[PDB]
């Protein structure tokens, strides 16, 4: 399956509303590894799509530039990405994804 996490944090052990022990939430956050996870989330590339799907979903944006004749869809994707003038740090082109 594909999981979706929703992490919950203990404010204090006296079962009290409003009161918050900094050291409890700090160490729970740390062992949950969120400071490391968020770093790789921003540093890497979370979205990913197959080239044929990318073209079929967005071709309208570059229909005049993309050729009608049959070829590797990644060329059409490159043409569209160029037409959008995206910064090369914002994406990475694989063989499929």
């Amino acid at each position: 399956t594909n999981p979706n996490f929703v992490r919950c944090i203990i404010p204090n052990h006296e079962k009290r509303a409003g009161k918050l022990d900094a050291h409890l939430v700090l160490e729970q956050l740390r062992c949950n590894g969120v400071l490391e996870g968020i770093r790789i989330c921003r540093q890497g590339f979370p979205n990913r799509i197959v080239f044929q799907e990318f073209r079929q979903r967005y071709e309208i944006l570059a229909a005049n530039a993309i050729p009608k004749g049959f070829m590797d869809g990644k060329q059409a994707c490159i043409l569209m990405i160029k037409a959008l003038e995206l910064d090369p740090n914002l994406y990475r082109i694989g063989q499929s994804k």
């Binding site: 956050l29 740390r30 969120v34 400071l35 968020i38 770093r39 989330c41």
Partner: peptide, 10 residues
């Protein structure tokens, strides 16, 4: 979102 922070600090 924590992803939007200018600098990652605990």
């Amino acid at each position: 979102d924590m992803a939007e922070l200018t600098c990652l600090n605990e």
